[PDB]
Amino acid sequence: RWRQTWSGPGTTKRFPETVLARCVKYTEIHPEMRHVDCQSVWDAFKGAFISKHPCDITEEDYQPLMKLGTQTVPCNKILLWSRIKDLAHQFTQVQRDMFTLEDTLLGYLADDLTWCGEFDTSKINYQSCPDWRKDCSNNPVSVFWKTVSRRFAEAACDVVHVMLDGSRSKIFDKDSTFGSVEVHNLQPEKVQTLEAWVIHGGREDSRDLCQDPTIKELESIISKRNIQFSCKNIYRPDKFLQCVKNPEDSSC
């Protein structure tokens, strides 16, 4: 075919193999997840979207996968991110100072992948998948991130951190998943502070991007959930990672 059904990229080539090698790899490394049967995980994942219309996925469809990938992560060491994941991941790999959702099993399975099924068939669609915007929001990928991120946010306690993309015009964006899901699922009974780290892009002598209007809007949205706000600029993410690695007082 010269024209696809849907507007978005199709299921990642070799998706089921990748998911599968991900899981085996994850649960070999993480002793907490050793009880996990990776074939069961894949079957639960498949079951969420195979033979289902890819615009009528619900969070219930993912319940079996959520149940199998139940994981306790230290609730006080959660790193959220919005838009800017590569630094967040590079940071957590330095000495596990925190945990991003991609450091949980479910997150690690799905990072960077796309996937969908078709209604009248029980195959996987490698040709095209729904775009959240042009097509429908209730698709397999969006509903997955929504359901798993809601649960991750609800488990956070104490000081939760979030890395933001200070090179955007909207450093905090209400309409991102962080802005629309995670932030409204931080629990007032558990979360003491949300501290944002605003990662600069451009050269040298930047503003204190912590006084940005959208950052003020974030502060005020979370206050009005009874959670304190703190914010830090990361002016040079290069030297930040380097200080994280070699905190040795280079000038860190």
Side-chain angles (χ1 to χ4, degrees):
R1 268 202 268 124
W2 51 94
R3 146 169 17 63
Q4 299 311 152
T5 294
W6 310 110
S7 259
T11 294
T12 313
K13 63 146 144 36
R14 280 176 31 92
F15 179 74
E17 291 96 307
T18 303
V19 166
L20 201 83
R22 286 190 178 182
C23 182
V24 164
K25 201 225 190 170
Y26 185 94
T27 60
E28 292 181 334
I29 287 168
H30 299 98
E32 66 271 16
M33 303 304 271
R34 282 181 289 177
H35 58 275
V36 188
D37 180 315
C38 280
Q39 182 64 47
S40 299
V41 172
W42 164 239
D43 292 327
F45 208 148
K46 283 206 284 225
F49 68 89
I50 284 296
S51 313
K52 267 129 183 207
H53 191 294
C55 294
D56 194 24
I57 307 302
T58 62
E59 311 207 336
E60 293 79 349
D61 290 319
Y62 273 110
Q63 282 320 291
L65 170 59
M66 299 277 97
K67 194 196 175 186
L68 301 189
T70 286
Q71 183 171 181
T72 323
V73 359
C75 72
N76 59 316
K77 309 197 175 279
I78 290 193
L79 178 64
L80 302 177
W81 59 262
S82 194
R83 273 67 197 266
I84 189 186
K85 95 189 174 186
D86 287 2
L87 211 231
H89 293 165
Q90 298 171 192
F91 167 65
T92 60
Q93 301 166 174
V94 168
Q95 55 214 141
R96 318 129 34 214
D97 280 317
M98 303 177 201
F99 297 73
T100 67
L101 184 63
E102 301 72 33
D103 300 302
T104 65
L105 174 67
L106 297 180
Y108 178 86
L109 297 177
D111 202 19
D112 295 316
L113 295 184
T114 302
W115 66 88
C116 57
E118 325 145 20
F119 174 52
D120 53 348
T121 184
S122 53
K123 281 131 148 182
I124 285 182
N125 195 340
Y126 296 100
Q127 297 291 71
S128 69
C129 285
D131 181 68
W132 195 87
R133 228 200 168 211
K134 303 70 170 291
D135 294 311
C136 59
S137 59
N138 283 352
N139 63 256
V141 181
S142 300
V143 175
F144 168 93
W145 287 105
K146 178 164 157 126
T147 308
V148 297
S149 78
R150 175 184 166 276
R151 306 151 138 306
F152 189 65
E154 297 183 316
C157 70
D158 300 345
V159 181
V160 168
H161 297 80
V162 57
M163 272 195 185
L164 299 169
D165 190 356
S167 56
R168 303 296 166 95
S169 48
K170 290 163 189 159
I171 305 186
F172 168 66
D173 188 1
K174 305 173 309 202
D175 291 313
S176 59
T177 317
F178 167 67
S180 59
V181 178
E182 275 99 340
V183 83
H184 297 283
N185 288 290
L186 298 166
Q187 296 297 275
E189 307 71 8
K190 317 196 290 196
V191 176
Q192 197 245 0
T193 298
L194 182 59
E195 164 156 303
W197 293 345
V198 172
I199 312 300
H200 303 220
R203 288 204 227 170
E204 287 149 282
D205 67 12
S206 215
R207 294 81 88 235
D208 169 7
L209 286 192
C210 285
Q211 307 312 316
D212 188 79
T214 70
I215 297 295
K216 294 294 138 200
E217 173 90 353
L218 174 53
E219 176 167 39
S220 122
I221 290 171
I222 78 153
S223 311
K224 288 177 79 315
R225 291 197 145 236
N226 282 336
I227 295 165
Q228 292 176 187
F229 183 76
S230 178
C231 178
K232 310 229 182 254
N233 281 279
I234 300 187
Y235 293 98
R236 276 164 127 290
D238 36 333
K239 154 134 146 41
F240 172 72
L241 266 194
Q242 187 61 20
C243 285
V244 172
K245 297 173 202 182
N246 297 190
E248 329 303 11
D249 300 5
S250 61
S251 59
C252 287

